[PDB]
Symmetry: C3
């Protein structure tokens, strides 16, 4: 239970950090 | 309380996948 | 070890809301 969740949360958190860097870079292109 | 959690992570998993999809797509369409 | 998990589910939940917001706009801002 606990462990499984913990795994799945660090992965999603991992993904999230990247997703944000991408969106930040998308914002730059398009226009500020 | 653990099923609860499974439930919110369940939600986050899904929303993350549709987000990434949207972003990848946008990245493509936008271009430089 | 429970509060930690709970506290992480919130970072993800929090960032998730903001990112969907960011992309939703860029979408309209691109026509997409």
């Amino acid at each position: 239970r606990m462990k499984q969740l913990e795994d799945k949360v660090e992965e999603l958190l991992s993904k999230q950090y990247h997703l944000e860097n991408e969106v930040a870079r998308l914002k730059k292109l398009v226009g500020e």
